[PDB]
Amino acid sequence: IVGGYTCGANTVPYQVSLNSGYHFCGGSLINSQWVVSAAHCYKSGIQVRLGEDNINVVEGNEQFISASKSIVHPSYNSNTLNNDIMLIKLKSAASLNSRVASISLPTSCASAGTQCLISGWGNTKSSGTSYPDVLKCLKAPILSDSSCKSAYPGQITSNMFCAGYLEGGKDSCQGDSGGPVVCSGKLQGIVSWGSGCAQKNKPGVYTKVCNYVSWIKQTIASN
Numbered sequence: 532i533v534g535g536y537t538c539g540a541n542t543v544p545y546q547v548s549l550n551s552g553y554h555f556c557g558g559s560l561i562n563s564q565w566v567v568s569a570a571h572c573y574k575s576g577i578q579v580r581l582g583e584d585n586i587n588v589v590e591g592n593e594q595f596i597s598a599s600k601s602i603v604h605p606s607y608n609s610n611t612l613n614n615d616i617m618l619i620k621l622k623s624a625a626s627l628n629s630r631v632a633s634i635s636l637p638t639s640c641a642s643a644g645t646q647c648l649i650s651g652w653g654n655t656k657s658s659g660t661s662y663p664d665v666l667k668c669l670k671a672p673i674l675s676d677s678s679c680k681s682a683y684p685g686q687i688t689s690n691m692f693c694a695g696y697l698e699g700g701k702d703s704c705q706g707d708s709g710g711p712v713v714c715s716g717k718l719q720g721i722v723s724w725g726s727g728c729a730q731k732n733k734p735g736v737y738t739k740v741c742n743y744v745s746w747i748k749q750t751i752a753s754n
């Protein structure tokens with residue numbers, strides 16, 4: 532997250548870190564057995580880390596649980612990142628408590644101008660690199676689909692939206708991928724892609740979760 536603030540420990544209790552020896556992507560806990568992330572985060576060997584603030588220090592609220600199954604969206608296209616969503620089932624149920632909690636799925640899509648909370652452990656610099664240990668947060672509005680499509684001509688689909696600031700300075704960045712965009716208490720987006728970080732006229736692009744709620748609910752009920 533560039534241009535954000537330190538969330539504070541366990542203030543985003545649905546935020547997960549996906550770990551394969553190291554943090555590599557965020558995700559969101561949607562019930563005690565299932566995490567939502569980005570399909571471009573797919574890999575074998577995932578351990579889901581719940582209850583994290585500093586990802587390099589064991590602070591007392593963590594739960595580390597291996598993934599038992601990953602399910603990339605049937606229509607994920609890695610060239611275009613259309614349908615950039617994946618489900619991860621935990622080998623054992625998380626213990627839900629205040630520090631570890633699920634986030635609700637949308638019942639309908641969110642509108643342009645709605646403010647959302649984006650979080651993660653990605654890079655905090657817009658030119659160089661600096662990776663935080665503690666979780667970072669950013670408040671950002673959903674942008675109009677026309678400004679999104681104007682920023683990235685030929686690349687935005689109906690399964691994507693942009694959020695952030697066309698003037699630059701505030702955005703998601705490398706390492707935030709897969710993490711949550713929560714608006715009015717619902718998981719509306721997943722950190723998906725962009726061009727650079729926090730650059731002018733290049734806002735972040737996010738998977739539009741509301742289009743996937745039926746697939747999510749059917750998939751978890753059958754798995």
Ligand SMILES: [Ca+2]
Binds near residue numbers: 589
């Ligand atoms: Ca920790």
